[PDB]
Amino acid sequence: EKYNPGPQDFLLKMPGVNAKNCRSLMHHVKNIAELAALSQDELTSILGNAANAKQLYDFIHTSFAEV
Amino acid sequence: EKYNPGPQDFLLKMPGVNAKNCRSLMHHVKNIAELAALSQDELTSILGNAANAKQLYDFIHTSFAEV
DNA sequence: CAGTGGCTGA
DNA sequence: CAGTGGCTGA
Numbered sequence: 001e002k003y004n005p006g007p008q009d010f011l012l013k014m015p016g017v018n019a020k021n022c023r024s025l026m027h028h029v030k031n032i033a034e035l036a037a038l039s040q041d042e043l044t045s046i047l048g049n050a051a052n053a054k055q056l057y058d059f060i061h062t063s064f065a066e067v
Numbered sequence: 068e069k070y071n072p073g074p075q076d077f078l079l080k081m082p083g084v085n086a087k088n089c090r091s092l093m094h095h096v097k098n099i100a101e102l103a104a105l106s107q108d109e110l111t112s113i114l115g116n117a118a119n120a121k122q123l124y125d126f127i128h129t130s131f132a133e134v
Numbered sequence: 135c136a137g138t139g140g141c142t143g144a
Numbered sequence: 145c146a147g148t149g150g151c152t153g154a
Contacts, residue, residue: 002132011131013077020139026131027136033127034135036103048139060100064093065070087149094147101145115149 007031016055021047036060074098083122088114103127 003026010032011017011025028046029035038046038060043053070093077099078084078092095113096102105113105127110120 004129004131004134006126006134007129008131010080013080018139020141023140024137025139030135031127031129031131032103036100037135046137046139052139059073061098062071062074063098064075065068067068085149087151089149091147091149095145097145104145113147113149119149 007035011035014056014059016043016047016052016057016059018052021049021052024048074102078102081123081126083110083114083119083125085119088116088119091115 008022008026011022012019017025024046025035028042029038038057040053040057043057044050047053047056075089075093078089079086084092091113092102095109096105105124107120107124107128110124111117114120114123
């Protein structure tokens, strides 16, 4: 498909994303902007899995360094 | 000052990033959430380069399919 | 932002 | 989110 291996791949690079919920993610978000804009509740609603949701939401909110 | 290879490396995985503006980016954003929350005008203020800003914001604002 | 976890070997 | 483009060989 026309799904560029850039932002599309970026989704699967997360510890809570697979090709299965990837299609849902990209269809629910514009790109990286909406991807990181998603909330834990949003994730479960799109991914349909609490584990995948928490894992994805986790990385999105994983601070670079703990001071 | 950990800076795990997860969110930190994620920054350097962009077409408009380097290690020099990486320290600026992480200091201006919490993690991925703020990373994608940045605007093209903001990127220039952080990265200090229009090219890097446009390139970084480009990817952030890159549609999964049909860029 | 808007879609469901969209696949898989013989 | 909050820091400046934070480096580099002899």
